[PDB]
Write a protein that binds this ligand. Structure first.
Ligand SMILES: CC[C@H](C)n1cc(C)c2c(C(=O)NCc3c(C)cc(C)[nH]c3=O)cc(-c3ccc(N4CCNCC4)nc3)cc21
Ligand SMILES: [Zn+2]
Ligand SMILES: [Zn+2]
Ligand SMILES: [Zn+2]
Ligand SMILES: [Zn+2]
Ligand SMILES: [Zn+2]
Ligand SMILES: [Zn+2]
Ligand SMILES: [Zn+2]
Ligand SMILES: [Zn+2]
Lengths: 466, 774
């Protein structure tokens, strides 16, 4: 059961709301992350003019609709929206939805009661991405056309001046498209049209009024060399980096040499300045001359073409497998289970060990059966080698085409390779995906994209007998 | 005994651990990250959505069509059900501020920008690929050499092979193959050791530099990353009498004549971002300045409390290191033929030694020639009356900053005439006056500028007075040192900037005073403009309002920047310098254009800087918006202070929060930390400097830059504050005081540090050490 990937369960199309007759898009989807464990998961899908809020409930009926739309909000202003994130009222604990777009303001909506909580004003251009800090749900980061990131606080002490921090200087020089928080809440990634990925270290913020925001002039790592194009989406995976650029058809897993979130947070005067205008990478973290970053792996993501603003999401949760999801620009949704890499490498190890420790007389047996290594050893005694093969390894001894199929999906030996999707689900009709979001317990995966369509994927369902 | 092919075979086998280690490492990091997956935090105790049912049905209403799916295919079950939903409309309570790009940071003074790269694509891409692989493989070269153990196939010997090969021509340089073969030398050992190194290199390029690929690297590419080879290809280099000259060379090369820092905004940047500091080396190094200090000396108190040689002058004193003989030599040369100050006391406190000791190692200077060829005065400028006359506006270009090219101040030996190659008399289209930094003395030289002659118990040095003010005629502010009648000495000191009664008397130093009029960012009254600048206090016609500060850039950097961005103020048209306020500047970047303005810019010469000052041309009431007529200044190169009541919304410059009529105007102190950091790191980046010079250079620079000195009038006071706040630090390490001693040495050589402060620092350092003796 733990090895199960999702399958399509529901799709819906939301009425066209940017009419010129069908160019409307869902640009963001995010599940509420503050409900008590096991509560029915709720998610918001953000179109250009509306926040669609829907509850998902597993069913026993193959033909029942698990989806119920519990709230529907229209931004009655002149703005077109494309970024959202969740937070919480600091006094009442009710959910707040933050919505942001091309006028440059973040609207915060009290969604259980259909009212505006407040507006965050100060950006000089459209906002393209929002992120809440995992360490403080009252801290939001916004990435703008104006080149800066702003850090906002909904905490009561900062109500008269809620911008606690601006990330400026000369880190970025064109519109930012992506902003992401590390789990500790103090490291922020930013990326955009200038092809630079930056890592900033935020200070601790005073818990009292701030007449001006802290300003930070220098990121602690900076590089335009990981991609060769505009970067439209970036994220931590623990201490590792995942990022994506237009025209490359990959998601790059890479790391910053010498960066550990177990070291102390460097201060702003530890940042590297640009004393050399020909260096395209600089890093405070560098431990003959070493790389400052290293490419680890490249998830192959074919047929994005020239589309940008297409975002992936990793499901990363204690005691469940990590899953990377992403939808391309031709109607396909790609999944990778990161725990298959270790189980595949562990399987290929036991295979090659036994093909020498028994001169080739090796029988391979499936797991996920009633059959132990102990039961299977009984059938041929100590004469033969029995190696247990993951059930999800399917052939295409073993064929050459089978080994190449398995290496393509699971071999991590080439950092400039292309790791094929582990599952690749086709989508009916033309569909460019913009954003993916997972439910807390990971049984739901929602992909939103053009045509105001949402595709809802399930696993671990309860359906039986139509 | 090897062949290229048997070597290429073994490198092939050794190379297949690279993907293996990679897979091992990626798998390890993936497994590690999964285990430390983060628990979701800040869970509520209760489902906040629990009470909310489906909203499916004059309310605004919207459609949703749902489909169900099943099977591995994802095929539907039917065409799907449709439902209508009420729409809650929420308007926002606030407007966005006007458009802007970049974070706008304040700077108190202009800063000097480096030239930036403009970022064929395929060559860029391929080099990146090769670089990434070079870093993959570099850690393997030495474990594999160890494992193969072929004679003469060592990292050093492969570096020697590379330096002797025909590609040392397209890659290398005079001094590049020199100091390679200085650290390494040419001998590669046995004839078979040279054969091995060359067969290895070729086997490597055959295995790893397969020209069929993008993931490919030559051995040369890896050897170039070596910590001992790389410095040879790094162009960040700072560089009896020849003893001193070489000791002070860091300070005579880096130390700025204007603001006394060693990384500052003055001086010239070249196309490759090599910087010529505005330093003693631009006016002849140590010697011309020093031979002149002596020549002035020949043509002419209390004891130190460290066992003064004046009283004592036994044995039992430790031997002397050569570091500390030099220390007494260079303080002996640059104090020179003094009457009121002698080395022994000051060396005595630099080094922890008794004042009588340095006298008995002292007791245990080239001759100075006395000429003044008497020159006839120019008819258009009397320097003793400090006045210009007759056709002066035609004989000189001293006031026409737009036509002027910059030159090193003259440091020749004779009169300032074309015949001796004096740049002042002859470099430009016309004579310009010699300035503070020329080695002539307005006594030898008729071209020397002598300051103005105004004195008045009222206001003076004004835009039009009986006798005009020569400083105002030359479009320059007064010099705190030359202009002794007008009060410039006190009014150009920024510590008196808000002494309103001081400044009601004695008026041509607004840029150095550094007080701008109270102004306020707001949304401009003009349609098709975003932000504008509004006066916050009454400004009378004639008053200075604000300076136009920004990044100083060259013509081609300006071009590169207009491209990169899809508003560049001209400072010096003929020299080609522009001020760019797109990111770094002050609130004057927000002043709008109008053909009928109420302020006006003027380029002013300010103590060998050029600077843009804005002056009112009408009375301006608080709340009024400021305009000036742009003209040609922007070429296409390709009583508490209160927020005024105004029709237009006003903004805090940083928070972009909206200001309310009548609350206190936000005066935010200027944040310069990010700027100190860049200068600290620019010094750190020099390969030419020892760690002990870096440490002191960076400690002085951090102090002196925050003071923005433009004038040696104020250096002795800040020099005293430095020795006081840092004397505990200067006597802790012996490196520090000796570096200190060179700074002092080269400031004395320029006669820029009076010796009344050298004997005073001798006190603070002897005292400081007396308290360290715990
Ligand atoms: C990188 C792009 C380009 C080179 N660039 C650089 C900067 C610094 C800058 C700014 C900006 O920082 N300004 C503030 C401001 C200043 C600094 C001075 C004055 C007198 N006044 C001001 O406001 C704004 C815009 C821009 C674009 C479109 C636009 N419109 C489009 C359609 N109509 C509605 C709005 N408006 C402004 C471009 C900029
Ligand atoms: Zn300077
Ligand atoms: Zn003495
Ligand atoms: Zn001269
Ligand atoms: Zn001169
Ligand atoms: Zn002269
Ligand atoms: Zn005067
Ligand atoms: Zn004067
Ligand atoms: Zn004056």
């Amino acid at each position: 059961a733990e090895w199960e990937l999702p399958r399509l369960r529901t799709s819906f199309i939301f009425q066209d709301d940017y009419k010129s007759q069908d160019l409307a898009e869902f640009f963001d989807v995010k599940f509420y992350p503050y409900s008590p464990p096991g509560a029915p998961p709720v998610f918001a899908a953000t179109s250009k003019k509306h926040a669609v809020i829907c509850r998902l409930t597993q069913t026993t009926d193959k033909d029942a609709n698990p989806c119920e739309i519990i709230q529907l909000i229209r931004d009655d202003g002149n703005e077109a929206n494309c970024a959202s994130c969740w937070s919480k009222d600091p006094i009442t604990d009710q959910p707040l939805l933050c919505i942001a777009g091309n006028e440059g303001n973040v609207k915060v909506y009290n969604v259980t009661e259909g009212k505006l909580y407040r507006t965050l004003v100060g950006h000089g251009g459209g906002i393209n991405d929002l992120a809440t800090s995992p360490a403080n749900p009252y801290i939001i980061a916004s990435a703008s056309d104006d080149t800066t990131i702003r850090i906002w606080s909904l905490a009561p002490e900062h109500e008269k001046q809620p911008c606690v921090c601006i990330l400026g200087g000369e880190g970025h020089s064109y519109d930012l498209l992506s902003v992401a928080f590390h789990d500790n809440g103090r490291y922020v990634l930013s990326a955009g049209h200038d092809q630079v990925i930056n890592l900033w270290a935020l200070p601790e913020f005073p818990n009292e009024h701030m007449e001006i925001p802290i300003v930070i002039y220098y990121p602690h790592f900076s590089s335009s060399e990981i991609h060769n194009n505009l970067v439209d989406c970036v994220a931590f995976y623990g201490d590792l980096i995942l990022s994506r650029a237009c025209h490359e058809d990959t998601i790059v897993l890479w790391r910053i040499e010498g960066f550990s979130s177990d070291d102390p947070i460097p201060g702003p005067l530890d940042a590297p300045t640009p004393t050399d205008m020909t260096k395209q990478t600089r890093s405070y973290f560098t431990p003959s001359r070493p790389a400052m970053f290293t490419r680890l792996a490249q998830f192959h993501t074919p047929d994005c073409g020239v589309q940008f603003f297409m975002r992936f999401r990793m499901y990363h949760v204690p005691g469940k497998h990590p899953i990377l999801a992403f939808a391309n620009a031709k109607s396909k949704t790609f999944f990778w289970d990161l725990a298959r890499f270790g189980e595949y490498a562990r399987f290929m190890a036991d295979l090659k060990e036994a093909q020498q420790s028994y001169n080739g007389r090796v029988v391979v047996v499936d797991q996920g059966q009633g059959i132990s290594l102990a039961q299977a050893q009984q059938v041929h005694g100590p004469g033969v080698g029995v190696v247990m093969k993951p059930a999800w390894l399917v052939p295409k001894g073993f064929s050459r085409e089978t080994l190449q199929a398995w290496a393509d999906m699971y071999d991590l030996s080439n950092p400039v390779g292309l790791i094929k999707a582990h599952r690749s689900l086709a989508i009916d009709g033309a569909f460019v995906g913009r954003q993916v979001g997972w439910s807390p317990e990971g049984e739901w995966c929602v992909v939103v994209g053009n045509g105001n369509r949402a595709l809802i994927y399930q696993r671990w369902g309860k359906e039986r007998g139509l | 005994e090897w062949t290229v092919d048997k070597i290429a075979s073994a490198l092939s086998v050794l190379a297949e651990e690279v993907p293996q280690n990679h897979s091992r490492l990626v798998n390890f990091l993936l497994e590690e990250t999964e285990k430390r997956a983060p628990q979701p935090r800040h869970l509520s105790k209760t489902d906040p959505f629990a009470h909310m049912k489906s909203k499916a049905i004059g309310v605004p209403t919207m459609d949703v069509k749902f489909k169900q799916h099943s099977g591995e295919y994802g095929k539907s079950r039917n065409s799907g059900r449709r439902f209508q939903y009420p729409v809650v409309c929420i308007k926002p309570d606030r407007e966005p501020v006007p458009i802007y790009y970049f974070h706008h940071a304040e700077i108190r003074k202009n800063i000097l920008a480096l030239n930036s790269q403009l970022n064929p694509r395929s060559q860029k891409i391929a080099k990146r690929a090769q670089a990434e692989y070079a870093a993959t493989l570099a850690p393997y070269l030495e474990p594999w050499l160890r494992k193969l153990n072929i004679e003469g196939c060592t990292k050093s010997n492969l570096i020697r092979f590379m330096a002797s090969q025909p590609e040392s021509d397209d890659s290398m340089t005079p001094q590049q193959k020199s100091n390679l073969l200085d650290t390494y030398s040419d001998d590669m050992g046995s004839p078979q050791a040279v054969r091995n190194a060359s067969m290895f290199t070729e086997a490597w390029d055959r295995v790893f530099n397969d020209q069929s690929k993008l993931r490919r690297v030559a051995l040369r590419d890896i050897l170039m990353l070596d910590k001992n080879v790389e410095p040879i290809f790094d162009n960040k280099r700072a560089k009896l009498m020849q003893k001193v000259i070489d000791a002070l060379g860091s300070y005579t090369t880096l130390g700025c004549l204007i603001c006394f820092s060693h990384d500052c905004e003055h001086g010239e940047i070249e196309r490759d971002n090599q910087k010529r500091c505005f330093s003693l080396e631009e006016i002849g190094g140590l010697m011309p300045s020093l031979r002149r200090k002596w020549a002035a000396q020949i043509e002419q108190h209390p004891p130190c409390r460290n066992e003064c040689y004046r009283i004592h002058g036994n044995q039992q004193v430790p031997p002397w290191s050569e570091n500390e003989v030099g220390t007494l030599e260079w303080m002996f040369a640059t104090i020179g033929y003094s009457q009121t100050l002698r080395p022994e006391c000051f060396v005595g406190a630099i080094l922890g030694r008794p004042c009588w000791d340095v006298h008995r190692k002292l007791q245990e200077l080239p001759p100075v020639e006395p000429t003044i060829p008497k020159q006839k005065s120019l008819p258009w400028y009397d320097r003793r009356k400090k006045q210009l006359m007759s056709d002066w506006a035609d004989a000189t270009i001293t006031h026409e900053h737009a036509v002027r090219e910059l030159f090193a101040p003259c440091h020749h030996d004779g009169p300032c005439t074309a015949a001796n190659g004096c740049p002042c008399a002859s470099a430009g289209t016309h004579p310009v006056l010699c300035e503070r930094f020329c080695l002539c003395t307005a006594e030898e030289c008729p071209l020397k500028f002598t300051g103005c002659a105004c004195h008045s118990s009222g206001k003076t040095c004004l835009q039009r007075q009986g006798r005009p003010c020569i400083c105002v005629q030359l479009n320059r502010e007064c010099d705190p040192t030359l202009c002794k009648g007008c009060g410039a000495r006190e009014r150009a000191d920024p510590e008196n900037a808000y002494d309103e009664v001081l400044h009601s008397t004695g008026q041509n130093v607004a840029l150095q005073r550094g007080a701008a009029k109270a102004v306020v960012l707001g949304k401009s009254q003009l349609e098709a403009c975003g932000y504008g600048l509004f006066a916050a206090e009454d400004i009378e016609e004639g008053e200075f309002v604000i300076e136009y500060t920004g990044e100083l850039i060259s013509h081609d950097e300006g071009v590169r920047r207009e491209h990169r961005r899809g508003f560049l103020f001209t400072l010096l048209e003929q020299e080609g310098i522009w001020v760019d306020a797109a990111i770094y500047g002050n609130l004057s970047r927000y002043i709008n254009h109008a053909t009928d303005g109420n302020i006006m810019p003027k380029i002013m010469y300010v103590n060998h800087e050029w600077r843009i000052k804005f002056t009112a041309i009408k009375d301006i009431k608080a709340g009024e918006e400021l305009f000036f007529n742009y003209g040609d200044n922007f070429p296409n190169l390709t009583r508490p202070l209160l927020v005024p009541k105004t029709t237009q919304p006003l903004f805090d410059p940083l928070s972009k929060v909206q200001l309310l009529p009548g609350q206190p105007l936000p005066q935010h102190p200027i944040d310069d930390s990010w700027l100190l950091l860049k200068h600290r790191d620019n010094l750190q980046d020099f390969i030419d400097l020892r760690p002990e010079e870096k440490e002191f250079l960076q400690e002085w620079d951090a102090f002196i830059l925050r003071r923005h000195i433009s004038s040696e009038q104020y250096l002795p006071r800040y020099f005293l504050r430095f020795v006081r706040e840092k004397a505990d630090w200067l006597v802790s390490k012996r490196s520090r005081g000796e570096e200190f001693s060179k700074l002092v040495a080269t400031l004395l050589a320029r006669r820029v540090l009076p010796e009344r402060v050298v004997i005073e620092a001798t006190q603070v350092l002897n005292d400081a050490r007396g308290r360290l003796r715990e």
